Assembly symmetry: C5
Homo-oligomer: 394 residues x 5
């Protein structure tokens, strides 16, 4: 009875085009904020952030004011889209094909005219994803909101601190905060300035998932590559194991490519670590070829360069702690035995070459192990957030 | 004739903005429930639940009341969207880009004013998917429904028990129940509290499909890896078989990655089992390298450490139940035969080393078999629902 | 002139909410049917059927009746959506996100009031896909149509036989028929019963495509696996060929996984055939390991068990139709020759072991060939529709 | 001033439901045509054609006629959707989920009443893709347009020749023409016949892209398979190379499966060529197994069948242009040398068997080369459009 | 008060169909331009460009003019879609399924009538992507805008220079400029000409990302292929390494296929480089087969052709800087030693053949290295933009 009477009363002469101010010259203060409920997705390949947001726009409509003594029990009213004047606050850096993913709900006014509008929405925003430090990355994704067609002389946008009480954790991202900032910028279209409120969603990637699925698996598969330096050459599978492991490591780069954007701003840390890993494994294949050249060396070929005979079989070897008828019968039997002596000398030369191959195996085992350890640690601890990560997520 | 007269009568002075109560001060009781017809999808990578639902909102419109004696035969009327007041009950934790996937249908009222509204919809909900125990997982997905813009002082939401008579089984999920709960929560936006009805869809994953496609296949491929310990070394394919099998096992981890979300809350049970499996296979490769070092051991290299000669060829070996011219001619023929004796001694030393390699093969066959059995069973039976599963689904 | 006059006449006092009956108490007969033009897609992973359909709803509007003598030449009129009363016949088991994929077109009425409404649409329906017999499967997909908000006491739904004259064949599916059925069911929401018309689209999968791309390719690749039993052991590639072929066969299971749903209702026939195939190939690898153990057997190791020496080298072998100074010089030359005799005896023992390996090769060639033939035929001919298929599609 | 006056004048008593004819009994002539701007996509897996089209519907509205002397300068007017009567010409064989992808624009009328309507749209059409001859295929995709709800007695549809002046070439398809045809068909729904205009878009696939990425790559990889017949057997990699190449060739069949639909109407030419290629490579593996059986033949096993000793080492071989104490000492030394003579005879028998293996290598090199050349050319030149293609696209 | 009065005043007799000119005969000048904010995507497979654009349409409405002295403080008004006349400027070469991706916002007018309309949108445009020079490619994507239904005699379209102040860099593309051009074209539909404004977005691909992920990885994997010419033949893994590396290189062609469109206009530079690389690696496999034929050459087979003995072991070899009872006992011992001499001669012939294999290894190492260097550099520096790229992006 009083809700009916008031609803009829409030739409007499009301125009949803008129900015609801009493004095036309003064701008209309709109307080803007948001409640972040969830970080639904971070599409780094497409540079998009999908969030569940409850935008919070509060202002004062000069015309929607009633005296509750004359409408007992009627303390608030609600208006759907298109019936009340609303601020046309859009997300500037939107990535949604419709460009406006907001779901239009009611505007709740009280007896004093204060209008409250809390549209829910799944919002896609074009966010620059700094992949320089991935997986130990922190992203600062801006959500820039402003009135599209009202300038500062008409809509005085004011910012209120972001709401995160109802935020639901993600699993992959630790909300580090949503600091906001109000700016007054000038545009090349127009002379009247335009204010905007930009909320910078700061997100820390939780590194356990990518650590367990990308970093540690590659470390351990990369470690298998070093087993080539412990394999004997006579097994006939050094090259097979090494080349198989290297070409298996490409799957991780393929996975990263499925994740990372095709940008040239920088090289992600994961790529630099994966690249150094493959280069070290590839150099192990090159060194395996050299080792097999030493092992399969023709004894009657070139002689052993003194530089090799000392740099490897003396120093590096020590460092590693390795270490008438009867005359015709005499002639024939002496050729057989001299042939055997020549074969013994050839085996001895081949044995020394095989020893050189083994010494090289051990030196490169040590050197590639040290290279792996340093490169891995020095590339991973070059991330500013590395320590924070290992402490929080492991 | 009477349907026409009544329809004209019911829209005189009717405003779809007014809450249809007789006394403005009292809240309007809306009974909310749903009928779950099907679980269409559980997107665990995106943390979304897609369901076919017939939301059930029943309330009383004070104005839509007629006396059937004056409209004979006209016992119910129907109103489309936008013509009658409706409760704006939205799904809070919606994952749909439009945010509101409800399909708007008629509101069936009777002569007494009781309005019945049963919109169908394909609803996507942002559900936290606990992947800790996958594939033997049980999920509790909340569907939180509430009036967006009416608080407790205006819309007295009441819950009715969920309907599942028409539920159509899924194939992958056993509905364990849909218990509901009505809550009265306060929000940081507003002072008036807001009630909601949350239905927790409890779902048990049927484990036959993932058991047959992930667990048993990996067990059997992982078992092939143990055949390396039965392969002879002279075959020259131990490393080939082992490394090939391990890098083949990566496909299962790739499949899981296609399924699982990128979250750091926990490690899924499937991942822990797959990881232990690959580590055991990788250790078999490491032990294969050691075995080949023993098999391909240079007889003139280091001598056999006593610790090895006993720990392997005495105890472990027993445990396993294994086990002038003529003078010149004499000189030359004696060098040939002494050379043969030296080769025999070298074959004997190599034969002992090959025996050590075989004993290690057998010990690691036993040990890796026991490791496989324990780890597999102890990781699978660490799931609370494991027994329930094996009994219902196998 | 007469079309204008009649259109103005027909909308006087017309309300699109009123069911167009003369007597309010009697239900309104709506004849429902459909014309199936094409089967666009069968998504078995998502359990959805996409069809091009021209729903056919015919009824009688009591008010849209004119005398053609008073409107010469005006024999039919047309009304767009929202202007005429229509039956709100929805597809209950809809899988479309909008839930209602119907495209709203005109309602053609004649001078006698008979209204004809033929909306086109691309309809997605949640259909249970029985994958038990795939690829030789027949599916029965229900399209359940009914008025959402009118019960039996108001809308007397009646079924007309489905139209298939304009049906366009698919390539993958042979329409076996679209039998319909009218049901009168009661629902737990309401007391008035609700009728529905369900058309069961029965579809036979044409098996040539999946036969050529899945079954015959796997048969032939699986046949290559049997070549291991004809490969000599000295080639040093038995394990390589066998393990390579088995891990190559996984691609077919991966393809099926891309096709099949993740359901535990049953095991598809394709999976049972692929699984038996991989198990037979995997057992060939196990038997290859045993063969290589026999081939690479240390002559000075264990002696040949009599059970083996007869079960293989006697019966199975036959069945297969296989089959002072001079004294010092005498001493030294006699040791060399006795060494040669010991090597000859060792070669003879190794030769017998290699013969055992060859006999096992042949027996398993025969046995795995017979296993392959039976298992393949017995799993494929266990499908009821197998014969129908091979006759129609090959 | 005159544009305002005329716009007000033209909507007096205008009803967008009335067919704008002067005499109700006569059908209304609508001239239909289209301008094809681009062929955006041919989805052969889904059997859909996506095109950018400017449908051209011209007719005469009896009511939208003004005398330009009374409205100086006002020579044309424009009307948006829903304000003027339009022909409801839909695309019958539509594949779009909305079913109607047309974008509604203005209808430009002149002073004489001739209405011109040129809606743009991205149109998806359900087109049967004959994949029999792919990649050398020509497709005939029908776009069938007609009034949905006006029959021949009301809407006299007439066809105008298709417009292609503004057509933008594609890269993959050579528009061979868009011949149209007007038909008058009867439908099982209705008695009044219904006319339609069907434009058959005829498209020739440009074969350079698929030739370079599928046909020539497979030819060259398939050629590598023939290198097995030039590899020596002692290399120990014949089976490895052959089996690796064959299982690598599966990627091309996987690519085709990603492209081709799952239809049983026919076997695409690409599939028949790829299948013959894999069968020839697979037979090379089978022949490699036989070659290795000849190479690794036990000299003390079966004797050489005369049929082999002539069919291979005589004819085929020629065709190819290949080709007391002292007594004890005498006894012992004569056993050693007789042992050597037995080894020489065994090497000779093995040498003849290895020669047989080499002759078989050469014969199968020749035969599989000829098989490859014929099969390739005879399958590729069995396409009617093969010559046209090679001449236009290479 | 004055905003309300003016809004009521401005819609009296206003018709959004009338072109707002004072003199009907003269065309209406519309100034068109755009502000490019971001290049969201370049889909080269689909030939589509996705951009964030703020179209800028400014014109003069003759009717929306007020005197600010009579409406103090009211200096601008705003009108939503459908209430004010707007230019129907569409994107002709649109690729969006809806065809019109513009988001409709307000039209800001001032007291003098100048209307300003700045709709945001995510625009998809059908752009011909010249992939001839990819990854060092520059694309010229046209955005063609024009009034759909107003010709030159009615809407005088005029171009304003594109705005790029607020442009946000991409990562993958360097905006080289957005030059625009106004054209006056005639169409085959109509006699009145139609003007359009086409903005050609010129974009330079930043080549660091594709350089690091495609070009350098392939170079380095292709370099591993050359290690076959340094591998010894006795290792028994030349063919394995070479064939494995070649079939691994196919992944890059697969990646390019995922990126490139299926067009026959040209061959992308990346494809020509990848193709030459695989052909060079494939020829290394062919040469590896020849090398193994030389290494595994039967000594008692054909004799060494003089042409080989000089072209390889003399010139190329030098260029590369390589280099009674006792009588019976005499008979028997002389046969053994003559057998040894025959084996020595056979080893010498085999040794010369192995030397030929080694010389061929070295020559092809040199030749394939030079081929790799030239082909790589000559294909990469055949791109016009190659130098620009290497200087800006590396
Ligand atoms: C055409 C397709 C290829 C089909 C078959 C392979 C062709 C070669 C088979 C014969 C090998 C030669 C041989 O020695 O065989 C021996 C065994 O042979 C048998 O008795 C069985 C042979 C048939 C095998 C069937 C399974 C094929 C595997 C699937 C392959 C499918 C390929 C799929 C294509 C993608 C014969 O014995 P023997 O040596 O003569 O004994 C000497 C006796 N003596 C001591 C008294 C002297
Ligand atoms: Cl009513 C109408 C609609 C479209 C057109 C056409 C003329 C120019 C070129 C295509 C389109 N714009 C002309 N008239
Ligand atoms: Ca993420
Ligand atoms: Ca699921
Ligand atoms: Ca199907
Ligand atoms: Ca195509
Ligand atoms: Ca791009």
């Amino acid at each position: 009875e009083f809700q009916r009477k008031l609803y009829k009363e409030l739409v007499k002469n009301y125009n949803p085009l008129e900015r609801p101010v009493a004095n036309d010259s003064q701008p209309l203060t709109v307080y803007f904020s948001l409640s972040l409920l969830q970080i639904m997705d971070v599409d780094e390949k497409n540079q998009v952030l999908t969030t569940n947001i409850w935008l919070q726009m509060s202002w004062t409509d000069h015309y929607l004011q009633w005296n509750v003594s004359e409408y007992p029990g009627v303390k608030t009213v609600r208006f759907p889209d298109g019936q009340i004047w609303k601020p046309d606050i859009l997300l500037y850096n939107s990535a949604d094909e419709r460009f406006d993913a907001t779901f239009h709900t009611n505007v709740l006014v009280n007896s004093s005219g204060h209008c409250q509008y809390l549209p829910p929405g799944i919002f896609k925003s074009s966010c620059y994803i700094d992949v320089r430090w991935f997986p130990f990355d922190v992203q600062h994704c801006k959500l820039k909101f402003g009135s599209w067609s009202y300038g500062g002389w008409s809509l005085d946008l004011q910012m209120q601190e972001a709401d995160i009480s109802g935020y639901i954790p993600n699993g992959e991202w630790d909300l580090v905060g949503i600091p906001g900032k109000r700016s007054e910028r000038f545009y090349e279209c127009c002379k009247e300035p335009y204010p905007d409120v930009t909320f910078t969603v700061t997100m820390r990637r939780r590194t356990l998932y990518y650590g367990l699925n990308l970093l540690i698996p590659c470390v351990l598969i990369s470690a298998l590559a070093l087993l080539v330096f412990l394999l004997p050459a006579d097994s006939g599978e050094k090259i097979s194991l090494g080349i198989t492991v290297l070409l298996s490591l490409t799957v991780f780069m393929l996975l990263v490519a499925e994740i990372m954007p095709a940008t040239s701003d920088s090289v992600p840390l994961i790529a630099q670590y994966f690249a150094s890993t493959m280069i070290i494994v590839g150099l192990s294949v090159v060194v395996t070829v050299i080792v097999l050249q030493y092992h399969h060396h023709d004894p009657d070929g070139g002689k052993m360069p003194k530089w090799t005979r000392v740099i490897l079989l003396n120093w590096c070897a020590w460092f590693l702690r390795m270490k008438p008828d009867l005359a015709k019968i005499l002639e024939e039997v002496r050729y057989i035995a001299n042939r055997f002596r020549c074969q013994d000398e050839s085996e001895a030369v081949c044995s020394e070459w095989k020893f050189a191959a083994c010494v090289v195996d051990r030196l490169c085992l040590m050197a590639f192990s040290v290279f792996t350890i340093i490169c891995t640690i020095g590339i991973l601890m070059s991330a500013p957030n590395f320590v924070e990560a290992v402490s929080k997520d492991f």
